[PDB]
Amino acid sequence: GSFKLTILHTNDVHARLEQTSRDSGKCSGEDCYGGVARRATKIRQIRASHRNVLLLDAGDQYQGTIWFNYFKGREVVHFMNSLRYDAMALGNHEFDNGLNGLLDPLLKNVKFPILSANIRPKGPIASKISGYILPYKIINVGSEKVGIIGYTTKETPVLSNPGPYLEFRDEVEELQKHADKLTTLGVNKIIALGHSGFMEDCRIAQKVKGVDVVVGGHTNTFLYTGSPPSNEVAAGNYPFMQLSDDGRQVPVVQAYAFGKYLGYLNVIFDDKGKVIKASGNPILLNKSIQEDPAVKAEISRMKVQLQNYSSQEIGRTIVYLNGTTHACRFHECNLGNLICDAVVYNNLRHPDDNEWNHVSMCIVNGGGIRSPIDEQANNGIITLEELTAVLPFGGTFDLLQIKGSTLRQAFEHSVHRHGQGTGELLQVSGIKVVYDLSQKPGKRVVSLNVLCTECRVPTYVPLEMEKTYKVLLPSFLAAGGDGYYMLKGDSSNHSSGDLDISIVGNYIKRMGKVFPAMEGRMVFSA
Amino acid sequence: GSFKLTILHTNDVHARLEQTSRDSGKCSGEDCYGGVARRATKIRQIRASHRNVLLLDAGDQYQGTIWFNYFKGREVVHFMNSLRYDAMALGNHEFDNGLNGLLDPLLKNVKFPILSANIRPKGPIASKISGYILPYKIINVGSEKVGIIGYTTKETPVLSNPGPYLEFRDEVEELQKHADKLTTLGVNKIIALGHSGFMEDCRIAQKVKGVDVVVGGHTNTFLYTGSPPSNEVAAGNYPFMQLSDDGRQVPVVQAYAFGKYLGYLNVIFDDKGKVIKASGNPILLNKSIQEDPAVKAEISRMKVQLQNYSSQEIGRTIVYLNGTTHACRFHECNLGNLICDAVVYNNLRHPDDNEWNHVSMCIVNGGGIRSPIDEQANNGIITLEELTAVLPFGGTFDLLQIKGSTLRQAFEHSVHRHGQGTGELLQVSGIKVVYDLSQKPGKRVVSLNVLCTECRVPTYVPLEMEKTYKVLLPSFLAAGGDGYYMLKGDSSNHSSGDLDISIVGNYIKRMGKVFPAMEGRMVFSA
Ligand SMILES: *[C@@H]1O[C@H](CO)[C@@H](O[C@@H]2O[C@H](CO)[C@@H](O[C@@H]3O[C@H](CO)[C@@H](O)[C@H](O)[C@@H]3O)[C@H](O)[C@H]2NC(C)=O)[C@H](O)[C@H]1NC(C)=O
Ligand SMILES: *[C@@H]1O[C@H](CO)[C@@H](O[C@@H]2O[C@H](CO)[C@@H](O[C@@H]3O[C@H](CO)[C@@H](O)[C@H](O)[C@@H]3O)[C@H](O)[C@H]2NC(C)=O)[C@H](O)[C@H]1NC(C)=O
Ligand SMILES: *[C@@H]1O[C@H](CO[C@@H]2O[C@@H](C)[C@@H](O)[C@@H](O)[C@@H]2O)[C@@H](O)[C@H](O)[C@H]1NC(C)=O
Ligand SMILES: *[C@@H]1O[C@H](CO)[C@@H](O)[C@H](O)[C@H]1NC(C)=O
Ligand SMILES: [Ca+2]
Ligand SMILES: [Ca+2]
Ligand SMILES: [Zn+2]
Ligand SMILES: [Zn+2]
Ligand SMILES: [Zn+2]
Ligand SMILES: [Zn+2]
């Protein structure tokens, strides 16, 4: 009397609706990957040949491409319902459009439960939202009952826009309460589904008695047993077998991100609800898997509707936005000033008491600004086509925790080859830097002043070498681009943020007219 | 035979719907003036005792109080119709909310002609806007026909937002074409009604053959015969008799502004349309004239709605907006930075020739900022009530043409008593000032750099002593307040702008969240 459960799972799909390139960009080439149409095919084939199948999502369907900026989650609702997901745990980006952008459209229109056990409401609007979200759900699978408990990263307040009246509690403390409740209700098979990262997933697997399987996300973790099928590098076996405090192996799974893989885990339980076997591997959604015709047709219709989003006037510039190489790579460029003002504006989060905001600074290397925008071309009208010329790579702006000394080392790197025309020079917001190019490379920073966060009135204070700062920066720099090895982020100090063109476009739309100046954010001693 | 025409006229009423103080601020109830209810009474009394009466408005009903900010011209439609104006010429401020804000509600709902002969539509606007704005109107008055030709200042593209498809032509040339047309049509009594200022009114009186009377506005010009009744000083007789090029004495009239006076001119024409006599005086609308109870009840009903509106959330601050005297009168205050950023944003106009905008700088004396706004008080919610606490006097931000030498003299005055806590210290936008307070008073300005206008990318350049600049500044300073005699403007170098709390409120409404920093716009060197 044993029970075989097949778990299919996705996480951090991040608005990759259409099939993508191998790097989950726009597929311009022959061999494409992922997309909902391909996922729908593999899910259907598995459901037709496997007896007991659960389809779970571990959060962060929101945010990532213009698909989310235009359809605002209606594309998530539509295809998750069409694919018949059995449950979804909330990710940090599901709060990107606030609690109203979560209620409408997601909470109001999904045909499956939305789970998050470690969220406590404190205001009337937040408690309205939480009425829609359950801490767990019992799902009938064949003759058996499977309990699924949700959880969401405690960093959602700093990463996204849940508002001040939504509290994110400790995952292990909240999950144990609902595991114990499920046990008393007679449910002996329990899956923890959530968006807090691989390390937190392993802690849950270790500490929460009664949890049999952990399905996570947030860290884009790729696990594989054997030689992986594409260019992602495995951080461990799939599933990762975490030894519990109870002396059992608890399978922990994630399936990378961007819909490139479909998680596929076969779990066998004994008749007491103990996992006796757990095996499988994430399925690479490459050209060998046919795109489902009906989903592909709906995508092809929606691509036509996206043309409105791409050619609509967002706003206007009344000044030349000087994104030429000669400007952005050699001195202060007013376009760089606008981009980093837009980035700071997008990361204004509910202040937690001792700060007017958790971050006040942004940087972007001149090499990341790929084109000017001419205000004389078409009455300064800005659409996504002009913004794509500036920011063509579909990257994000991320949050990096960084010591003052490290930050100052980045600004030394910013002018260590100044004059050679490469893309290092940092355009900034919330920073005043003074350079002396006469000096030897590595000693050209005269002074750095930054906008305080621990203040009621933002004001410029000297950078402190031993203090820890938050800084916004392009994903390219956070991966070490352009020799910025000291800006490289990891799971301990780095968080993936919002799409770059979406950040800038929203800002331009808010301003209506833009006229950024060269204002002395960087000063050359000459 | 002779023909007696009584002309009643208003100009630059500027949203003074309720009765006002002597200086056209908010009334205390002690001794009030103007308001539409009082004007309605005097108009009724004159119509009951005079045979042939015309009630004309020479423009600038729009803009000036919270009445215009909320009702957006619906209050002008309502009471100008109820008072049965016979004609109105468009003023520069009728374009403050663009053509859409002029068409709706004013052009489509007034029950009297709207006149402006020197406005030429282009392309899409043409069709109906040609039908809504007429160059002239023939009005039957008793047994006679009186032609009224409208005109509007050519400076409207720079003062307001008429948009790119409206051309403003020369007043004398266009008025002459239509005077000739009216003359050929058999109309021998012709009134020029318009909004271009006293100097242009007299030029029209001198040069436009066939014009018998000029009724003007824009400059708030006060004319009176004999000793004036209040604190306004007469710039000339009422009417002002301009000798025409062909030896005709042409009466020119204006009636100050803000509805304090009702213009009142008795004109005697002979049977061939020549003015034989022009006599009268503007009627001071003081408490000896009763507020019409029915109009007052309508005002009171509408004011109840305005009181609700003034307590509504416009936006939020996530920082303390430090409008305390200790900040704004001694050093850089982030609230002053926001105010003048809002002022510059409000004055972005269609750039002609060589400039990204016609003005780039704003100043506001610390003494004009009367309160902070606490971000901890009510979740940082900003309403019109909070803005009224900061800017309580109902003033405007005006445009002043000023040479660099005078501006530098103004910034010396800004710190000549620094430390005494008086209100001179200038908060700025688009200006970088460096002070040295150790120097003798009058020599404390180290440097002044300003945002260039004649540039594609705004950038800071040294102030040139002999160059003429445009600067935005409060109505209080343009009148010489706080010892700034050198900022005092006249019609040759000064233009009255929009209500201060509307400028700030609209910017906050657009920004959504505000977070101004102290960023070194002014620096006190050791
Ligand atoms: C966008 O930024 C670029 C780079 O800063 C601007 O180009 C540069 O413009 C400056 C000032 O016009 C030039 O300095 C001067 O050039 C003129 C004629 O080229 C020369 O006669 C002067 O002696 C002085 O050196 C600079 O050479 C020029 N550099 C390049 C590579 O073009 C550009 O003007 C900016 N775009 C806009 C629309 O403002
Ligand atoms: C709004 O602006 C005012 C004016 O600057 C601020 O008041 C001033 O705040 C400073 C703190 O930055 C006070 O200074 C410090 O003084 C104490 C002695 O009391 C000493 O520890 C140091 O010498 C330090 O410089 C200053 O005394 C204070 N002035 C007054 C008249 O209160 C005010 O804090 C600002 N409001 C907010 C909410 O930020
Ligand atoms: C007061 O206003 C509340 C919110 O309304 C908004 O602002 C007012 C000023 C109007 O412009 C309204 O159209 C806006 O939606 C109302 O909920 C409330 O009913 C108002 N109070 C009364 C007595 O009507
Ligand atoms: C096109 O985009 C604009 C801007 O988001 C939106 O307001 C409008 O409704 C869209 N039009 C259609 C037909 O979807
Ligand atoms: Ca179990
Ligand atoms: Ca005549
Ligand atoms: Zn994610
Ligand atoms: Zn995440
Ligand atoms: Zn006026
Ligand atoms: Zn005017």
mmCIF file of C-alpha atoms in Angstrom, chain A residues 63-312:
data_model
loop_
_atom_site.group_PDB
_atom_site.id
_atom_site.type_symbol
_atom_site.label_atom_id
_atom_site.label_comp_id
_atom_site.label_asym_id
_atom_site.label_seq_id
_atom_site.Cartn_x
_atom_site.Cartn_y
_atom_site.Cartn_z
ATOM 1 C CA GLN A 63 7.678 40.830 -13.657
ATOM 2 C CA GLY A 64 10.328 40.221 -16.309
ATOM 3 C CA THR A 65 9.158 41.279 -19.785
ATOM 4 C CA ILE A 66 6.813 43.799 -21.349
ATOM 5 C CA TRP A 67 4.195 41.020 -21.273
ATOM 6 C CA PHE A 68 3.757 41.699 -17.562
ATOM 7 C CA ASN A 69 3.946 45.480 -17.999
ATOM 8 C CA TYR A 70 1.069 45.423 -20.491
ATOM 9 C CA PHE A 71 -1.197 42.586 -19.297
ATOM 10 C CA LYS A 72 -0.363 43.194 -15.602
ATOM 11 C CA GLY A 73 -0.861 39.573 -14.519
ATOM 12 C CA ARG A 74 -3.863 38.789 -16.714
ATOM 13 C CA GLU A 75 -1.409 36.765 -18.787
ATOM 14 C CA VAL A 76 -0.468 34.862 -15.630
ATOM 15 C CA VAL A 77 -4.114 34.224 -14.746
ATOM 16 C CA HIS A 78 -4.985 33.127 -18.276
ATOM 17 C CA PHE A 79 -2.289 30.515 -18.804
ATOM 18 C CA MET A 80 -1.971 29.202 -15.227
ATOM 19 C CA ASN A 81 -5.715 28.488 -15.364
ATOM 20 C CA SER A 82 -5.367 27.024 -18.864
ATOM 21 C CA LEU A 83 -2.504 24.800 -17.691
ATOM 22 C CA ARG A 84 -4.570 23.908 -14.578
ATOM 23 C CA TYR A 85 -2.013 24.614 -11.880
ATOM 24 C CA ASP A 86 -3.032 22.943 -8.635
ATOM 25 C CA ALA A 87 -1.592 25.593 -6.287
ATOM 26 C CA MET A 88 0.706 28.604 -6.297
ATOM 27 C CA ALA A 89 2.817 30.175 -3.591
ATOM 28 C CA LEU A 90 3.290 33.942 -3.638
ATOM 29 C CA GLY A 91 6.669 35.318 -4.635
ATOM 30 C CA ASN A 92 8.153 38.704 -3.880
ATOM 31 C CA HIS A 93 7.330 40.029 -7.355
ATOM 32 C CA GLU A 94 3.653 39.154 -7.001
ATOM 33 C CA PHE A 95 3.556 42.358 -4.906
ATOM 34 C CA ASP A 96 5.216 44.549 -7.559
ATOM 35 C CA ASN A 97 1.949 46.365 -8.346
ATOM 36 C CA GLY A 98 0.936 46.596 -4.694
ATOM 37 C CA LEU A 99 -1.922 44.782 -3.036
ATOM 38 C CA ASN A 100 -4.445 46.047 -5.578
ATOM 39 C CA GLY A 101 -2.296 44.713 -8.418
ATOM 40 C CA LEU A 102 -2.251 41.322 -6.650
ATOM 41 C CA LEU A 103 -5.991 41.181 -5.921
ATOM 42 C CA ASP A 104 -6.723 42.328 -9.473
ATOM 43 C CA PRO A 105 -6.232 40.271 -11.487
ATOM 44 C CA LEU A 106 -4.538 37.315 -9.768
ATOM 45 C CA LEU A 107 -6.441 36.657 -6.538
ATOM 46 C CA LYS A 108 -9.815 37.376 -8.148
ATOM 47 C CA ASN A 109 -9.460 35.108 -11.180
ATOM 48 C CA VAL A 110 -7.200 32.117 -10.556
ATOM 49 C CA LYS A 111 -8.986 28.772 -10.396
ATOM 50 C CA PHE A 112 -6.496 27.367 -7.867
ATOM 51 C CA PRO A 113 -5.523 28.238 -4.290
ATOM 52 C CA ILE A 114 -2.892 30.891 -3.586
ATOM 53 C CA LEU A 115 -0.778 29.947 -0.605
ATOM 54 C CA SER A 116 1.346 31.871 1.870
ATOM 55 C CA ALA A 117 1.368 30.865 5.537
ATOM 56 C CA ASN A 118 3.846 33.448 6.891
ATOM 57 C CA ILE A 119 1.861 36.591 5.934
ATOM 58 C CA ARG A 120 -0.031 38.454 8.742
ATOM 59 C CA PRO A 121 -2.297 41.384 7.777
ATOM 60 C CA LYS A 122 -2.558 44.542 9.872
ATOM 61 C CA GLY A 123 -4.737 46.905 7.809
ATOM 62 C CA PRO A 124 -8.201 46.764 6.248
ATOM 63 C CA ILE A 125 -6.958 46.542 2.648
ATOM 64 C CA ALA A 126 -4.321 43.963 3.576
ATOM 65 C CA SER A 127 -6.880 41.836 5.435
ATOM 66 C CA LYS A 128 -9.166 42.023 2.394
ATOM 67 C CA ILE A 129 -6.316 40.568 0.339
ATOM 68 C CA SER A 130 -5.423 37.874 2.883
ATOM 69 C CA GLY A 131 -9.042 36.658 2.872
ATOM 70 C CA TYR A 132 -8.147 35.340 -0.613
ATOM 71 C CA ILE A 133 -4.839 33.685 0.431
ATOM 72 C CA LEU A 134 -4.698 30.490 2.446
ATOM 73 C CA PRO A 135 -1.824 29.296 4.655
ATOM 74 C CA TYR A 136 -2.284 25.780 3.246
ATOM 75 C CA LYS A 137 -4.631 23.650 1.168
ATOM 76 C CA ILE A 138 -5.456 19.945 1.269
ATOM 77 C CA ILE A 139 -5.640 18.555 -2.265
ATOM 78 C CA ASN A 140 -7.243 15.228 -3.175
ATOM 79 C CA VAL A 141 -4.902 13.222 -5.422
ATOM 80 C CA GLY A 142 -6.380 9.876 -6.376
ATOM 81 C CA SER A 143 -7.560 8.227 -3.180
ATOM 82 C CA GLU A 144 -4.998 10.198 -1.139
ATOM 83 C CA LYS A 145 -4.790 13.624 0.505
ATOM 84 C CA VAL A 146 -1.782 15.921 0.045
ATOM 85 C CA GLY A 147 -1.368 19.022 2.190
ATOM 86 C CA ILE A 148 0.468 21.994 0.664
ATOM 87 C CA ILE A 149 1.723 24.857 2.846
ATOM 88 C CA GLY A 150 2.831 28.111 1.259
ATOM 89 C CA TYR A 151 5.508 30.585 2.284
ATOM 90 C CA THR A 152 7.001 33.814 0.922
ATOM 91 C CA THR A 153 10.377 35.458 1.515
ATOM 92 C CA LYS A 154 10.586 37.831 4.488
ATOM 93 C CA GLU A 155 12.394 40.315 2.242
ATOM 94 C CA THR A 156 9.255 41.092 0.223
ATOM 95 C CA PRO A 157 8.842 44.463 2.069
ATOM 96 C CA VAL A 158 12.253 45.606 0.806
ATOM 97 C CA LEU A 159 12.062 43.948 -2.623
ATOM 98 C CA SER A 160 8.520 44.796 -3.627
ATOM 99 C CA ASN A 161 5.398 46.778 -2.693
ATOM 100 C CA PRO A 162 3.266 44.821 -0.189
ATOM 101 C CA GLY A 163 2.616 48.069 1.678
ATOM 102 C CA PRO A 164 3.058 48.832 5.376
ATOM 103 C CA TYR A 165 0.110 46.755 6.634
ATOM 104 C CA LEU A 166 1.380 43.327 5.514
ATOM 105 C CA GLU A 167 3.791 41.470 7.800
ATOM 106 C CA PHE A 168 6.068 38.595 6.672
ATOM 107 C CA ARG A 169 6.836 36.170 9.517
ATOM 108 C CA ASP A 170 9.483 33.518 10.023
ATOM 109 C CA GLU A 171 8.897 30.624 7.636
ATOM 110 C CA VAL A 172 9.904 27.800 9.974
ATOM 111 C CA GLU A 173 7.788 29.092 12.877
ATOM 112 C CA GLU A 174 4.634 29.520 10.775
ATOM 113 C CA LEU A 175 5.042 26.301 8.764
ATOM 114 C CA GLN A 176 5.370 24.143 11.884
ATOM 115 C CA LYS A 177 2.003 25.426 13.127
ATOM 116 C CA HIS A 178 0.236 24.394 9.948
ATOM 117 C CA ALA A 179 2.145 21.134 9.622
ATOM 118 C CA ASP A 180 0.979 20.239 13.142
ATOM 119 C CA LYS A 181 -2.572 21.215 12.191
ATOM 120 C CA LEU A 182 -2.443 19.102 9.023
ATOM 121 C CA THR A 183 -1.164 16.150 11.064
ATOM 122 C CA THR A 184 -4.159 16.336 13.472
ATOM 123 C CA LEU A 185 -6.514 16.605 10.500
ATOM 124 C CA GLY A 186 -5.204 13.215 9.355
ATOM 125 C CA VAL A 187 -3.047 14.425 6.436
ATOM 126 C CA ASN A 188 0.244 12.541 6.481
ATOM 127 C CA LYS A 189 1.698 13.838 3.188
ATOM 128 C CA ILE A 190 2.850 17.456 3.359
ATOM 129 C CA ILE A 191 4.581 19.597 0.714
ATOM 130 C CA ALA A 192 6.106 22.975 1.566
ATOM 131 C CA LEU A 193 5.742 25.234 -1.534
ATOM 132 C CA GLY A 194 7.325 28.653 -1.278
ATOM 133 C CA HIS A 195 9.502 31.527 -2.438
ATOM 134 C CA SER A 196 12.341 32.124 0.008
ATOM 135 C CA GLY A 197 15.453 30.674 -1.651
ATOM 136 C CA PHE A 198 17.363 27.402 -1.605
ATOM 137 C CA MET A 199 18.976 28.001 1.789
ATOM 138 C CA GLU A 200 15.633 28.718 3.424
ATOM 139 C CA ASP A 201 14.116 25.737 1.592
ATOM 140 C CA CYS A 202 16.770 23.515 3.170
ATOM 141 C CA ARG A 203 16.156 25.023 6.621
ATOM 142 C CA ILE A 204 12.440 24.272 6.245
ATOM 143 C CA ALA A 205 13.248 20.734 5.138
ATOM 144 C CA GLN A 206 15.488 20.374 8.171
ATOM 145 C CA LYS A 207 13.414 22.013 10.903
ATOM 146 C CA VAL A 208 9.686 21.605 10.161
ATOM 147 C CA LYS A 209 8.598 18.220 11.463
ATOM 148 C CA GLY A 210 6.058 16.630 9.145
ATOM 149 C CA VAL A 211 7.236 18.301 5.928
ATOM 150 C CA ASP A 212 7.953 15.582 3.361
ATOM 151 C CA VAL A 213 8.906 17.605 0.255
ATOM 152 C CA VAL A 214 10.062 21.190 -0.321
ATOM 153 C CA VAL A 215 9.370 23.001 -3.624
ATOM 154 C CA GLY A 216 11.029 26.394 -3.735
ATOM 155 C CA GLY A 217 12.171 29.355 -5.812
ATOM 156 C CA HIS A 218 13.489 32.938 -5.490
ATOM 157 C CA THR A 219 17.140 31.951 -5.983
ATOM 158 C CA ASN A 220 16.695 30.549 -9.519
ATOM 159 C CA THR A 221 18.425 27.419 -8.229
ATOM 160 C CA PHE A 222 19.199 24.726 -10.814
ATOM 161 C CA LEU A 223 19.531 21.169 -9.500
ATOM 162 C CA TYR A 224 20.271 18.180 -11.715
ATOM 163 C CA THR A 225 21.313 14.554 -11.266
ATOM 164 C CA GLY A 226 23.820 13.506 -13.902
ATOM 165 C CA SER A 227 25.075 15.665 -16.719
ATOM 166 C CA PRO A 228 22.780 18.667 -17.300
ATOM 167 C CA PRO A 229 21.141 19.089 -20.729
ATOM 168 C CA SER A 230 21.896 22.780 -21.369
ATOM 169 C CA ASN A 231 24.297 25.513 -20.232
ATOM 170 C CA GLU A 232 22.991 25.934 -16.664
ATOM 171 C CA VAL A 233 25.372 24.566 -14.018
ATOM 172 C CA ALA A 234 23.846 22.368 -11.309
ATOM 173 C CA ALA A 235 24.341 23.398 -7.690
ATOM 174 C CA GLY A 236 23.420 19.892 -6.526
ATOM 175 C CA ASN A 237 21.528 16.709 -7.263
ATOM 176 C CA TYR A 238 17.856 16.742 -8.194
ATOM 177 C CA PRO A 239 16.211 16.337 -5.795
ATOM 178 C CA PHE A 240 18.545 17.709 -3.162
ATOM 179 C CA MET A 241 18.235 15.264 -0.262
ATOM 180 C CA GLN A 242 18.204 17.311 2.934
ATOM 181 C CA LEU A 243 18.639 15.336 6.148
ATOM 182 C CA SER A 244 15.881 16.397 8.526
ATOM 183 C CA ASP A 245 16.192 16.871 12.255
ATOM 184 C CA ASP A 246 14.042 13.697 12.377
ATOM 185 C CA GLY A 247 16.679 11.637 10.579
ATOM 186 C CA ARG A 248 14.832 11.386 7.240
ATOM 187 C CA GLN A 249 15.783 12.563 3.762
ATOM 188 C CA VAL A 250 13.524 15.437 2.643
ATOM 189 C CA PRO A 251 13.618 16.117 -1.132
ATOM 190 C CA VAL A 252 14.202 19.790 -1.937
ATOM 191 C CA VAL A 253 13.638 20.982 -5.503
ATOM 192 C CA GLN A 254 13.788 24.131 -7.583
ATOM 193 C CA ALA A 255 13.693 24.411 -11.386
ATOM 194 C CA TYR A 256 15.918 27.380 -12.333
ATOM 195 C CA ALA A 257 13.776 30.190 -13.799
ATOM 196 C CA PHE A 258 12.227 31.776 -16.868
ATOM 197 C CA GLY A 259 10.205 28.690 -17.808
ATOM 198 C CA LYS A 260 13.233 27.015 -19.438
ATOM 199 C CA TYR A 261 12.678 23.797 -17.458
ATOM 200 C CA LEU A 262 9.625 21.998 -16.122
ATOM 201 C CA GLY A 263 10.327 20.533 -12.705
ATOM 202 C CA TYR A 264 9.570 16.817 -12.614
ATOM 203 C CA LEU A 265 9.823 14.897 -9.310
ATOM 204 C CA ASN A 266 8.459 11.390 -8.640
ATOM 205 C CA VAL A 267 7.886 10.824 -4.909
ATOM 206 C CA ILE A 268 6.901 7.456 -3.456
ATOM 207 C CA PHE A 269 5.325 7.440 0.029
ATOM 208 C CA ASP A 270 4.753 4.486 2.322
ATOM 209 C CA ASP A 271 1.307 4.043 3.812
ATOM 210 C CA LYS A 272 2.211 6.276 6.764
ATOM 211 C CA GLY A 273 3.155 9.244 4.583
ATOM 212 C CA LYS A 274 6.928 8.801 4.738
ATOM 213 C CA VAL A 275 8.900 9.370 1.548
ATOM 214 C CA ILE A 276 10.667 6.114 0.716
ATOM 215 C CA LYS A 277 11.894 7.176 -2.768
ATOM 216 C CA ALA A 278 12.307 10.488 -4.609
ATOM 217 C CA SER A 279 13.786 10.797 -8.085
ATOM 218 C CA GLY A 280 13.561 12.662 -11.374
ATOM 219 C CA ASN A 281 15.032 15.696 -13.127
ATOM 220 C CA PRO A 282 13.815 19.054 -14.501
ATOM 221 C CA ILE A 283 12.712 18.685 -18.121
ATOM 222 C CA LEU A 284 14.445 21.022 -20.558
ATOM 223 C CA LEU A 285 11.772 22.710 -22.680
ATOM 224 C CA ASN A 286 13.720 22.781 -25.969
ATOM 225 C CA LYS A 287 12.769 22.244 -29.639
ATOM 226 C CA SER A 288 12.261 18.492 -29.123
ATOM 227 C CA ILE A 289 9.007 19.410 -27.348
ATOM 228 C CA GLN A 290 6.261 20.735 -29.612
ATOM 229 C CA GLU A 291 4.591 24.032 -28.812
ATOM 230 C CA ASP A 292 0.960 23.283 -28.002
ATOM 231 C CA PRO A 293 -1.004 24.679 -30.987
ATOM 232 C CA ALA A 294 -3.838 26.281 -29.010
ATOM 233 C CA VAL A 295 -1.568 28.047 -26.528
ATOM 234 C CA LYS A 296 0.748 29.132 -29.351
ATOM 235 C CA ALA A 297 -2.230 30.628 -31.195
ATOM 236 C CA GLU A 298 -3.272 32.635 -28.116
ATOM 237 C CA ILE A 299 0.313 33.882 -27.723
ATOM 238 C CA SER A 300 0.398 34.907 -31.389
ATOM 239 C CA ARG A 301 -2.814 36.916 -30.869
ATOM 240 C CA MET A 302 -1.414 38.532 -27.723
ATOM 241 C CA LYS A 303 1.804 39.504 -29.503
ATOM 242 C CA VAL A 304 -0.376 41.584 -31.832
ATOM 243 C CA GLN A 305 -1.992 43.293 -28.861
ATOM 244 C CA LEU A 306 1.457 44.127 -27.462
ATOM 245 C CA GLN A 307 2.035 46.360 -30.484
ATOM 246 C CA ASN A 308 -0.157 48.998 -28.788
ATOM 247 C CA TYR A 309 2.118 48.951 -25.736
ATOM 248 C CA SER A 310 5.241 49.260 -27.907
ATOM 249 C CA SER A 311 4.191 52.226 -30.042
ATOM 250 C CA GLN A 312 2.281 54.240 -27.456
#
